[PDB]
Amino acid sequence: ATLICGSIAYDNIMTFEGRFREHILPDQVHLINLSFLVPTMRREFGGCAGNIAYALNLLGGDARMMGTLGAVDAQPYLDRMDALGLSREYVRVLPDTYSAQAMITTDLDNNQITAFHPGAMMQSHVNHAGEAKDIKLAIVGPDGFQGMVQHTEELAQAGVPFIFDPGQGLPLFDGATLRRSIELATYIAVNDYEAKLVCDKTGWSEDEIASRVQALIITRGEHGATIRHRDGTEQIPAVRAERVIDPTGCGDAFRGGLLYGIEHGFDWATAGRLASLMGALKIAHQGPQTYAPTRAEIDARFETAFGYRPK
Amino acid sequence: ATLICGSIAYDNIMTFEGRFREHILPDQVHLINLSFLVPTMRREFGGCAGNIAYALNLLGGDARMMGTLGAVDAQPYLDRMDALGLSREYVRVLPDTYSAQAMITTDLDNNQITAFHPGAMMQSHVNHAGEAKDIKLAIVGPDGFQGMVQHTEELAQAGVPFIFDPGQGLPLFDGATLRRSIELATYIAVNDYEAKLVCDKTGWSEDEIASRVQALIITRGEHGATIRHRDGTEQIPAVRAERVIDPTGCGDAFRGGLLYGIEHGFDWATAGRLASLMGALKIAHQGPQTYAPTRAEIDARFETAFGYRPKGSKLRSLEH
Ligand SMILES: Nc1ncnc2c1ncn2[C@@H]1O[C@H](COP(=O)(O)OP(=O)(O)O)[C@@H](O)[C@H]1O
Ligand SMILES: Nc1ncnc2c1ncn2[C@@H]1O[C@H](COP(=O)(O)OP(=O)(O)O)[C@@H](O)[C@H]1O
Ligand SMILES: NC(=O)c1ncn([C@@H]2O[C@H](CO)[C@@H](O)[C@H]2O)c1O
Ligand SMILES: NC(=O)c1ncn([C@@H]2O[C@H](CO)[C@@H](O)[C@H]2O)c1O
Ligand code: NA
Numbered sequence: 001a002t003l004i005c006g007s008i009a010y011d012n013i014m015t016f017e018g019r020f021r022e023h024i025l026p027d028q029v030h031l032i033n034l035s036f037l038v039p040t041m042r043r044e045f046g047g048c049a050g051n052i053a054y055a056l057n058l059l060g061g062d063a064r065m066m067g068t069l070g071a072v073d074a075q076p077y078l079d080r081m082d083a084l085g086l087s088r089e090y091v092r093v094l095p096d097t098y099s100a101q102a103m104i105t106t107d108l109d110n111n112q113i114t115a116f117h118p119g120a121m122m123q124s125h126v127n128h129a130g131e132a133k134d135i136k137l138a139i140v141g142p143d144g145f146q147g148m149v150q151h152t153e154e155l156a157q158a159g160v161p162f163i164f165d166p167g168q169g170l171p172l173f174d175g176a177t178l179r180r181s182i183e184l185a186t187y188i189a190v191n192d193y194e195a196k197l198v199c200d201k202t203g204w205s206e207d208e209i210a211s212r213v214q215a216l217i218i219t220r221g222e223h224g225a226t227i228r229h230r231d232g233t234e235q236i237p238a239v240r241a242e243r244v245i246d247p248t249g250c251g252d253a254f255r256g257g258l259l260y261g262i263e264h265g266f267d268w269a270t271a272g273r274l275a276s277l278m279g280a281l282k283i284a285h286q287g288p289q290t291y292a293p294t295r296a297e298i299d300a301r302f303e304t305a306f307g308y309r310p311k
Numbered sequence: 312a313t314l315i316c317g318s319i320a321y322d323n324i325m326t327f328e329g330r331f332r333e334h335i336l337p338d339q340v341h342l343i344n345l346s347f348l349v350p351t352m353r354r355e356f357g358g359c360a361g362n363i364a365y366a367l368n369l370l371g372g373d374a375r376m377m378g379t380l381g382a383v384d385a386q387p388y389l390d391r392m393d394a395l396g397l398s399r400e401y402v403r404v405l406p407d408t409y410s411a412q413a414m415i416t417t418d419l420d421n422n423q424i425t426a427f428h429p430g431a432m433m434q435s436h437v438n439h440a441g442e443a444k445d446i447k448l449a450i451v452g453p454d455g456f457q458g459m460v461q462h463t464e465e466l467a468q469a470g471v472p473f474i475f476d477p478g479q480g481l482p483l484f485d486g487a488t489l490r491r492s493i494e495l496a497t498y499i500a501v502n503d504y505e506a507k508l509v510c511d512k513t514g515w516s517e518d519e520i521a522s523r524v525q526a527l528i529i530t531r532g533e534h535g536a537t538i539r540h541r542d543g544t545e546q547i548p549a550v551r552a553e554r555v556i557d558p559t560g561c562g563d564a565f566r567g568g569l570l571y572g573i574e575h576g577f578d579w580a581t582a583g584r585l586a587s588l589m590g591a592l593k594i595a596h597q598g599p600q601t602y603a604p605t606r607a608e609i610d611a612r613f614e615t616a617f618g619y620r621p622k623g624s625k626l627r628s629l630e631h
C-alpha cells in the first residue's frame with residue numbers, strides 16, 4: 001500500500017476568474033485591491049492527504065490516508081471515504097475537536113493565499129507512520145509540524161521510499177530541519193515558488209538538493225514540470241486542459257499520479273506524464289476532488305495526450 | 312441627515328501579518344503562495360455603508376444607511392443599529408435571503424483581496440436615494456452596480472451634494488458609466504490604487520477628473536491623503552497609529568470624518584485631518600467598526616495630533 005500523510009480538511013475556495021498578476025500596481029502605495037464576486041460558499045472535501053489519496057484511488061492504487069480529523073464535523077468526510085473505498089485505517093478522529101478548514105483565495109495561475117484553521121491537524125502527531133503496516137511507498141505532505149518531522153524520521157528509519165512534500169507547511173521549518181528532511185527523503189516534490197523558498201531556506205542549490213534525493217520534482221503550472229536528478233533532468237509537458245476553472249489541488253492530483261507511476265515501475269518520463277495528466281483533469285473542475293474520471297477515461301486521455309500507453 | 316448608500320455586509324477578515332510585496336516572485340509561474348494560521352471564524356459588522364455610517368455616528372452626526380440586508384441573517388445587524396442609534400429608515404430587509412458576505416485577505420500595507428458574495432446586495436437598487444427626505448449630503452459607495460449608478464443619477468437630479476466612492480465596485484463600471492458618474496458627483500473619494508484605475512478606465516488624467524468635481528480626494532494609506540479643490544491641494548498628514556492591527560475599513564472611517572467635516576463647514580484642511588484621524592483610530596482595532604472612541608477622545612486626539620480644536624463654520628455648513 002501507499003501511505004499518504006498530510007492534512008485532511010474542508011476547503012472554502014474562492015477562485016478569481018482572472019490573474020492577480022494583471023491587477024498588481026507596484027508603483028502605487030497600495031499594490032493590489034481587488035474585490036471579485038463569487039457564488040454561494042461550497043465547503044469542499046480537501047486537505048493534502050485527502051486530495052492525493054483521492055487521485056491515487058481514481059487510478060486504482062491502494063491509498064492509505066494518515067491524518068487527523070475532528071469529531072465535531074468529521075462525519076461527512078468519513079462517509080465519503082467509505083463511499084470511495086478509501087481505507088480509514090489511519091484516519092484518526094479526535095473527540096471534541098474541529099476538523100481543519102482552509103479558506104483559500106486564489107486565481108487561475110494557482111496563486112493560493114490561504115488562511116488555515118488547523119483544528120485537529122495540530123494533533124496530527126498522535127498518528128505514527130512507524131505504526132503503519134506493509135507500506136511500500138509514502139508521501140509526507142503539509143500537516144502539523146511535529147507530525148511532518150516524526151513521519152519523515154519513522155519512514156526513513158524503516159527504509160520506506162517517500163516523497164517529502166512540505167508545500168504549505170514550509171514556514172514551519174527552519175534551515176536545519178528542512179535540510180535534515182531532505183537528507184532523509186527519497187524524493188522531494190514542490191512547485192516552482194516553493195522550490196525557490198526551499199533553496200533559500202536550506203542554502204542549497206537545486207543541484208545540491210538533487211545530490212541528496214533520487215528525484216527533485218518541481219511543478220510549473222501550465223508549463224508542466226521538471227524532474228531533476230544528480231545526473232540529468234526530464235522535462236514533463238503539461239496536458240492542455242479542457243477548461244481552466246480552478247487550479248486548487250492540481251499539485252495533489254499530480255502527486256497521486258506520480259505515486260501511482262513510482263509504485264508501478266513507470267520510468268520518470270511516464271510517471272511524470274501521468275502526474276501531469278491528473279493535474280490537467282483536476283483543473284477543469286471547481287474544487288480539489290470534483291473531477292471524477294474513470295480509470296478507462298484516464299487511460300484514453302493519456303493516449304490522446306501523449307501518443308502511447310504506459311507500462 | 313446624511314444619506315450613506317453602499318453595501319451592508321458581514322466581513323470575515325484574514326490578516327496576513329506581513330506585506331504581500333515581500334512574497335511576490337514574478338519570475339516563477341506562481342507569483343505568490345501563502346498559507347498562514349488564523350483563529351476561529353468570526354463575522355464582523357461591515358459593508359461600506361455600515362462602516363461609513365458607524366464613523367459618522369461616532370462623531371455625533373446623523374447617518375442614514377441606505378442598503379439591503381437578507382432576512383436569514385440580518386437580525387444581529389438590525390439589533391446593532393438599534394443599540395448604536397443608527398436609523399433603519401432606509402435599510403431594507405429581503406425575505407428568505409442571506410446578507411452580503413465578504414471574505415477579505417489583508418496585509419499590513421492595506422492591500423486587500425476580497426471574495427464578495429453579494430446576497431441581498433444584488434437587489435440594492437430597490438431603494439431609491441432621490442426619495443429620501445431632508446438629506447443634506449450623501450455618499451454613494453461600493454454596492455450592487457445598478458444601485459450605485461441609480462443612486463448617482465437620483466442624487467444629482469435631486470440636487471443633493473454627494474461623494475462618489477466607486478471603490479471596490481470599479482470592475483463593474485465601463486468608461487462611459489464611470490465618466491458619467493464623475494460628471495454628476497460633487498466630490499470623488501478614492502484610494503490611490505483606485506484613482507489609477509479610474510484614470511485608466513475614464514481616459515482622464517487626475518487634472519481632468521478634478522475639473523469635473525468640487526474636490527478629488529485620494530487616500531495614500533499611512534502616507535496620509537490629498538484633497539484637490541478649486542484653489543489648491545491640501546496635503547493631509549497621517550496620524551501616527553497607536554498600533555496597526557487591521558487596515559480593513561480605514562478608507563470608510565476616513566469618509567465618515569470627511570462627511571462630518573463637509574456637513575459642519577470645516578475647511579478642507581480640517582475636514583481632511585479629521586478623516587485622517589478616524590483612519591488612524593480605526594487601524595488600531597480588528598474589524599472595520601470595533602474602534603469605539605468617545606467623542607471627547609476624538610477631539611483630544613485631534614488636538615494632540617494637529618495642535619488645534621476641530622471646528623467648522625455655520626456659514627460654510629450644509630442645510631437641506
Ligand atoms: N493551466 C494548467 N493547464 C494544464 N495543466 C495544469 C495547469 N496548471 C497545473 N497543471 C498541471 O498540474 C501540475 C501541478 O500544478 P501546480 O500549479 O504547479 O501545482 P501546485 O498546485 O502544487 O501549485 C502542473 O505541473 C501541470 O501538470
Ligand atoms: N498605517 C496607518 N497609519 C495611520 N493611518 C492610516 C494607516 N493606514 C491608513 N490610515 C488612514 O486611513 C486613510 C485611508 O487608508 P487607505 O489605506 O488609503 O484607504 P482604503 O481603506 O480605502 O484602501 C489614510 O489616508 C490614513 O489617514
Ligand atoms: N497545512 C496548511 O497550511 C495548508 N494550507 C492549505 N492546505 C490544503 O492544501 C490543499 C491544496 O493543495 C487544500 O485542499 C488545503 O486543505 C494545507 O494543508
Ligand atoms: N462591493 C464590493 O465588491 C465590496 N468588497 C468589499 N466590500 C466591503 O468593503 C468594506 C471595507 O471598505 C468591507 O467592510 C466590505 O464589506 C464591498 O462592499
Ligand atoms: Na534524501
Ligand code: NA
Binds near residue numbers: 492523
Ligand atoms: Na461632477
